[PDB]
Copies of this chain bind each other. A is one copy, B any other.
């Protein structure tokens, strides 16, 4: 009956990226959520024309302030961030995260959206500001490209990914989920923990599917979050999420972008299709 999640990410009028993926998934899981937008764009940035604007600092401040003063954030237990068009919004979000976490315990999943397949699709000022943002997170979900940028290491293998994670765990970050580390005809996901006394690092090997991956990572993020919110242990929540995503992609015609609307009946799938491999 009250809002449990605050999610700060991008919005597109048509298509499924950022907070618009968030909306479909968290609504379908029936998780009450505040969606604060960082953009109001016609369509994602992969098109030749991208109408609309980033949200202005002063409007973002105004929004956050109104949520606070009207007590619409009083029961937030989860915070998620995603895409930012500008670093000022990132620094402001840091201020907001600090004030949230000073008051109460809130689990912050930072999806450090910067780029993919070795190419950034964010401003350089955002890239730099994201290095500061992640330090406040409870769990981060970079892809390999993101992880490389965040740490300054090459990430072309699981062993490199492990080294890279270690640098971020030393900064205080408790949990790092690395998506789409490369391996022959497959892709590896790595879940790495700062506290390896009480938690076990693991990998999942996923067969590579050819086709358009617009919105894939964002979908994974929100499906994972939703199962975390429901109380599914993290190993299981990861396996469910990547299992669901594989199911969605197997039911997408290859050239088409995944249609999250059409795949609503699959979102809450509980199949855990892959093997959890503990790394030694």
Contacts and interface: CB of A to CB of B under 8 A. Distances in A.
A63 B3 contact: no
Say how many copies of this protein the assembly contains. Answer: 2
Contacts of A55: 40
A124 interface: no
A14 interface: yes
B34 A14 contact: yes
Given A1-B259, A23-B23, A27-B24, A67 B42 contact: yes
A156 interface: no
B261 A72 contact: no
Given A62-B52, A62-B53, A67 B28 contact: no
Contacts of A256: 1
Given A13-B36, A30-B261, A49 B66 contact: yes
B53 A70 contact: no
Nearest to A53: B59
Contacts of A42: 36, 62-67, 70, 72
Contact of A43 (B11, B15, B27, B67): B67
Interface residues of A, number: 46
A133 interface: no
A52 B65 CA distance: 9
Contacts of A14: 3, 34, 67, 72-73
Contact of A72 (B30, B43, B259, B264): B43
Given A43-B72, A51-B64, 11 more contacts: A3-B14, A15-B72, A30-B262, A36-B42, A40-B59, A41-B63, A42-B67, A48-B69, A51-B67, A52-B59, A52-B63
Interface of A: 1, 3, 11, 13-15, 23-24, 27-28, 30-32, 34-37, 40-43, 47-53, 55-56, 59, 62-67, 69-70, 72-73, 256, 259, 261-262, 264
8 contacts: A13-B63, A30-B262, A32-B259, A42-B72, A49-B69, A51-B65, A51-B66, A52-B66
